[PDB]
Write a protein that binds this ligand. Sequence first.
Ligand SMILES: Nc1ncnc2c1ncn2[C@@H]1O[C@H](COP(=O)(O)OP(=O)(O)OP(=O)(O)O)[C@@H](O)[C@H]1O
Ligand SMILES: Cc1cccc(C)c1OCCSc1nc2ccccc2n1CC(=O)O
Length: 289
Amino acid sequence: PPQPRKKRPEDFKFGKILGEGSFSTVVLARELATSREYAIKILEKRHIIKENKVPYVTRERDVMSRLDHPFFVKLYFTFQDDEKLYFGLSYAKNGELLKYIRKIGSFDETCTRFYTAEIVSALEYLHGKGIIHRDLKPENILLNEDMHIQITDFGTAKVLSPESKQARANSFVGTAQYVSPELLTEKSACKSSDLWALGCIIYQLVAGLPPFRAGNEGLIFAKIIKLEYDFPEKFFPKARDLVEKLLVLDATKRLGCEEMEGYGPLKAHPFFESVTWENLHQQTPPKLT
Ligand SMILES: Nc1ncnc2c1ncn2[C@@H]1O[C@H](COP(=O)(O)OP(=O)(O)OP(=O)(O)O)[C@@H](O)[C@H]1O
Ligand SMILES: Cc1cccc(C)c1OCCSc1nc2ccccc2n1CC(=O)O
């Protein structure tokens, strides 16, 4: 059927800058005809063409248009003018998960469990659609007004082809602290690469820093490939067990991966015994302090 007319910049009142990326800016905007607030991500055509970023921008639009789940930032609309491309996104009022990790230092067990469960639920949805995120990290996990997660940053994501039963993707993308050993060694990622990142994030929620850390990327890569990390004292024992089952060098042996029979066994892990998986997005999140 028809859709709402394409929006234009003059349909909005723009407000504050919410953040700046290397080739994008996100601005808070109110749509004049509805009074709705959106986070509008704006890119300059000349700049993305000159810097060979067109594929990333197209990837982000294509992947986000496929998503329809409460734990992901929503793409409501797109438009362009002579100079710019615009994405109309849901506004995650409470910002990045990373901010809360730093402010609090270490999440308690109830908060670690709840936020971990939301991320697992999101990944189950994404993987079920054959999509690999490839850059999962706390900066890319936003929080809405109700303190539920909103995963974002899909320009480096990959839709695996169902037609060829594709399992592996060949683009070198991600963030050093969270990149999987298979990407470093075999130069390909798979859905299980996101489960490695999950393990790093759970560790970081409890420990305050991700497990493989160093002052530069090459040093981090060396630690990843050797599984060189340790747990701090008082790390919740069931969480430690879970992390140890995700931070596994062989991507086919990570809990939650297809070769380990999927999300059922992961959701059944003892760390999640008290979780009600069915309706997490309607549960009230535990207070962080
Ligand atoms: N939907 C949103 N709601 C609220 N804030 C957002 C939203 N999307 C992005 N932001 C904020 O804007 C920042 C800039 O996002 P953008 O995607 O332009 O770049 P980036 O991912 O931070 O940087 P780079 O692209 O260089 O990695 C984000 O880091 C985030 O803090
Ligand atoms: C992708 C692209 C990059 C640079 C310059 C141009 C001319 C260009 O084509 C836009 C054609 S359609 C389009 N592709 C998008 C990719 C991200 C966000 C908005 C987007 N829109 C405009 C739209 O969807 O209405």
